[PDB]
Amino acid sequence: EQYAMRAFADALEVIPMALSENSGMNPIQTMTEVRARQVKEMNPALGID
Amino acid sequence: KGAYQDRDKPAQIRFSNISAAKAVADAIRTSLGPKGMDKMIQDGKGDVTITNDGATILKQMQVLHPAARMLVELSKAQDIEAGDGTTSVVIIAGSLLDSCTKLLQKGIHPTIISESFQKALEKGIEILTDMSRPVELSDRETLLNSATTSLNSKVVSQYSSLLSPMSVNAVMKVIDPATATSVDLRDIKIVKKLGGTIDDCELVEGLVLTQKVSNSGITRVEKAKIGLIQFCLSAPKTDMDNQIVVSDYAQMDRVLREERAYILNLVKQIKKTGCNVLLIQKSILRDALSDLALHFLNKMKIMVIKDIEREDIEFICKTIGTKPVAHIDQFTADMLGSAELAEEVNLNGSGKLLKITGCASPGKTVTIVVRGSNKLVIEEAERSIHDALCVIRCLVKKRALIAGGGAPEIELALRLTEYSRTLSGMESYCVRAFADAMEVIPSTLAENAGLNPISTVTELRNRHAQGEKTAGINVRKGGISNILEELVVQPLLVSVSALTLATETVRSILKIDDVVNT
Amino acid sequence: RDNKQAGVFEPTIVKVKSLKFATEAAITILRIDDLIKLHP
Amino acid sequence: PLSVFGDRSTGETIRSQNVMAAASIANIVKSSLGPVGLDKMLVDDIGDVTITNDGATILKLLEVEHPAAKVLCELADLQDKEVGDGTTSVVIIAAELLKNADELVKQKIHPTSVISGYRLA
Numbered sequence: 261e262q263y264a265m266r267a268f269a270d271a272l273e274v275i276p277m278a279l280s281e282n283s284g285m286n287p288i289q290t291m292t293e294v295r296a297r298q299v300k301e302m303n304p305a306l307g308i309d
Numbered sequence: 310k311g312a313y314q315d316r317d318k319p320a321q322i323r324f325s326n327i328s329a330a331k332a333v334a335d336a337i338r339t340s341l342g343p344k345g346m347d348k349m350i351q352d353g354k355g356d357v358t359i360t361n362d363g364a365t366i367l368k369q370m371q372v373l374h375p376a377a378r379m380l381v382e383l384s385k386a387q388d389i390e391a392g393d394g395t396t397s398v399v400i401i402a403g404s405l406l407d408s409c410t411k412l413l414q415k416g417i418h419p420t421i422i423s424e425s426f427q428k429a430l431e432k433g434i435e436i437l438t439d440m441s442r443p444v445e446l447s448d449r450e451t452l453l454n455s456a457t458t459s460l461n462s463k464v465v466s467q468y469s470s471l472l473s474p475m476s477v478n479a480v481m482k483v484i485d486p487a488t489a490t491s492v493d494l495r496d497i498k499i500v501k502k503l504g505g506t507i508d509d510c511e512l513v514e515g516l517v518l519t520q521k522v523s524n525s526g527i528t529r530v531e532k533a534k535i536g537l538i539q540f541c542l543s544a545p546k547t548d549m550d551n552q553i554v555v556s557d558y559a560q561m562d563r564v565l566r567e568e569r570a571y572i573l574n575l576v577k578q579i580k581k582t583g584c585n586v587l588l589i590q591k592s593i594l595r596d597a598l599s600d601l602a603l604h605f606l607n608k609m610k611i612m613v614i615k616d617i618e619r620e621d622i623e624f625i626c627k628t629i630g631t632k633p634v635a636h637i638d639q640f641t642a643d644m645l646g647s648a649e650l651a652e653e654v655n656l657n658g659s660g661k662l663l664k665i666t667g668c669a670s671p672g673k674t675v676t677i678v679v680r681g682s683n684k685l686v687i688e689e690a691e692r693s694i695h696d697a698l699c700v701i702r703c704l705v706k707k708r709a710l711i712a713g714g715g716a717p718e719i720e721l722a723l724r725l726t727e728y729s730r731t732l733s734g735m736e737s738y739c740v741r742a743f744a745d746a747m748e749v750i751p752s753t754l755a756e757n758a759g760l761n762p763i764s765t766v767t768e769l770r771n772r773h774a775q776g777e778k779t780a781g782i783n784v785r786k787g788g789i790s791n792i793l794e795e796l797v798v799q800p801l802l803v804s805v806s807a808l809t810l811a812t813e814t815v816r817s818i819l820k821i822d823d824v825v826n827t
Numbered sequence: 828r829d830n831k832q833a834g835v836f837e838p839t840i841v842k843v844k845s846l847k848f849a850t851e852a853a854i855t856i857l858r859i860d861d862l863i864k865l866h867p
Numbered sequence: 868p869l870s871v872f873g874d875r876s877t878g879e880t881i882r883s884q885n886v887m888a889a890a891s892i893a894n895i896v897k898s899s900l901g902p903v904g905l906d907k908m909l910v911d912d913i914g915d916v917t918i919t920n921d922g923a924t925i926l927k928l929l930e931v932e933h934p935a936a937k938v939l940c941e942l943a944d945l946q947d948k949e950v951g952d953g954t955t956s957v958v959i960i961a962a963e964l965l966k967n968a969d970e971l972v973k974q975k976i977h978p979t980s981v982i983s984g985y986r987l988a
């Protein structure tokens with residue numbers, strides 16, 4: 261049952277990917293970097309510029 | 310910040326190609342492994358076939374998408390190179406294209422994906438080579454194991470005990486197992502006749518003819534002296550225009566007597582060499598056999614076989630050791646083929662079959678006759694025998710043997726995921742996707758057998774992670790077990806050719822960005 | 828009734844061949860998993 | 868999905884269709900079995916009428932389109948050629964055990980197992 265949970269996580273996390281792609285930036289790398297920033301410093305208010 | 314790439318048609322075309330390839334792969338997904346059940350194809354005309362070979366299924370099915378056509382060409386190329394795995398290669402190609410569709414959605418250039426797939430294939434070939442073990446000929450046990458494994462996923466599986474030993478004996482009786490480096494399947498003549506059951510298949514070291522004996526007075530010959538004929542046993546006629554003019558009443562008697570004497574001369578020269586069975590080549594523009602000639606041949610107690618195809622002369626000469634004659638002056642016993650016995654057998658009212666058996670001269674050729682109730686099982690049986698022969702050809706080509714039942718590709722998936730974890734960059738995701746798109750084969754083997762795909766694949770990954778290599782799906786046990794102890798192995802060339810061909814054709818597909826109607 | 832009394836006998840060939848041919852034909856037709864009917 | 872330009876029948880549908888075709892052929896041939904069986908009349912398009920009881924002649928004269936029934940017709944013809952007697956019996960047996968095997972399969976029993984069971988039986 262964790263497969264469905266991870267699929268849900270990815271599916272809801274596509275929204276920053278679409279946001280960055282619409283913004284012109286590379287989606288995957290920017291999204292991974294901002295996620296790493298969010299997990300390193302406990303500041304959950306970091307989003308796609 | 311970056312290129313706008315206003316054109317969106319390339320993305321649409323790429324996704325259409327990926328979707329078509331995935332659909333084609335899913336179409337034959339359920340026709341893989343021992344538990345996969347074959348497809349039924351009926352073309353425009355009312356002709357049907359019961360096919361389990363992926364190449365045949367894809368060829369008969371008239372597809373319309375360019376990706377599907379490239380996939381069917383891939384399948385036929387894999388059949389040509391190896392002869393087994395023509396379903397698994399298509400499944401792998403479609404599955405990893407479906408894997409790369411999300412890579413395209415993630416904002417990755419197709420060239421990066423193609424190069425990363427090439428690198429992943431390069432690593433995977435080495436992984437497969439390391440996983441293998443050496444295989445050497447004259448070990449009949451492992452050859453029988455490979456033949457049975459090749460035949461397990463076919464309708465003739467229950468006959469494999471009486472059909473795989475002869476399948477490998479056919480190859481072992483054609484090529485020298487010391488210095489071969491290749492074998493030929495042209496000199497393995499598969500002759501099919503309707504009637505009987507599969508358990509009546511036979512392997513003959515001699516020669517098999519579907520022709521019929523002209524003189525219905527002689528049926529069997531002991532200590533046969535076979536002689537091919539390439540000229541014609543009829544009234545003489547020159548290459549250029551031939552004409553005879555008669556001006557007197559005695560001339561008719563003269564021409565009739567002279568023609569009879571000429572034919573009798575030819576038949577006497579044929580008979581005086583000790584030839585007791587004659588083989589006439591199928592000749593046109595000149596009657597190969599005359600009724601008077603056939604009468605004389607029958608009078609001198611001979612057996613005559615006529616209407617023999619031109620392309621079969623090489624096969625007959627290689628089988629029974631005879632040499633063709635195109636002039637009567639060169640017809641001598643010193644170059645006349647010999648055999649222990651020649652028989653004409655009626656097949657329980659289903660046909661008439663000619664056997665030349667016990668050829669004293671050596672014969673580097675065997676013949677398989679396949680029997681079945683209806684025609685569909687006969688076609689599928691000859692296709693399965695061809696698959697087993699191609700497997701033995703793969704074993705002869707390069708001597709490397711690996712395990713099966715999902716073990717090779719799942720071990721490859723583990724090793725390639727571990728390799729991708731040390732490839733930080735934009736290619737890490739691509740190598741990871743390539744690694745995780747080769748778990749489609751174990752998943753398909755699990756779900757086609759009624760097993761639980763998720764738990765089976767997870768337990769397989771766990772087992773191979775601990776280094777318990779050559780561990781795969783077992784359908785007799787209904788679970789996961791060591792496969793080598795279960796006697797299921799396949800040559801390495803099949804897997805390597807499948808992987809390499811799939812990767813190359815996927816790179817070619819990725820290079821496409823547009824389709825235009827001409 | 829005892830068929831030996833009435834004499835109803837058939838050669839064993841008919842039974843053996845019928846059984847083998849029937850079971851093999853059923854095996855061949857039962858392997859079908861799906862059908863693709865191509866348009867003429 | 869697939870671009871084949873044809874018709875595709877997958878799963879239980881085609882299995883049931885094959886079983887129905889075999890049962891239809893068996894039902895045509897069944898009434899002409901036994902000493903009490905009454906023979907059939909086969910009349911052509913132009914009026915060429917014949918009266919027959921043997922299964923091989925009935926099936927050969929009939930026009931069959933479904934290949935799953937063409938298989939049974941060819942089975943009857945083969946039984947006629949190799950033996951001569953028992954042509955209706957082979958068709959009846961084949962269709963009945965095909966129906967029984969399909970009944971087994973409907974309960975999610977893998978057809979390879981039923982094929983091996985029939986072969987050993």
Ligand SMILES: Nc1ncnc2c1ncn2[C@@H]1O[C@H](COP(=O)(O)OP(=O)(O)O)[C@@H](O)[C@H]1O
Binds near residue numbers: 363397460
């Ligand atoms: N007895 C068996 N047990 C487990 N797996 C098997 C067995 N026989 C074949 N397989 C697997 O089924 C896969 C498909 O093989 P097969 O259908 O015979 O030819 P192809 O590879 O062309 O589909 C192979 O990769 C093989 O590993």
Ligand SMILES: Nc1ncnc2c1ncn2[C@@H]1O[C@H](COP(=O)(O)OP(=O)(O)O)[C@@H](O)[C@H]1O
Binds near residue numbers: 922956
């Ligand atoms: N006198 C009899 N008493 C009992 N059973 C009989 C008798 N005659 C025939 N039968 C049975 O009836 C069946 C009739 O088969 P039949 O339809 O004649 O064979 P076919 O299918 O070749 O026409 C046979 O299986 C036979 O066992």
Ligand SMILES: [Mg+2]
Binds near residue numbers: 393394458459460
């Ligand atoms: Mg195979």
Ligand SMILES: [Mg+2]
Binds near residue numbers: 952
């Ligand atoms: Mg009868």
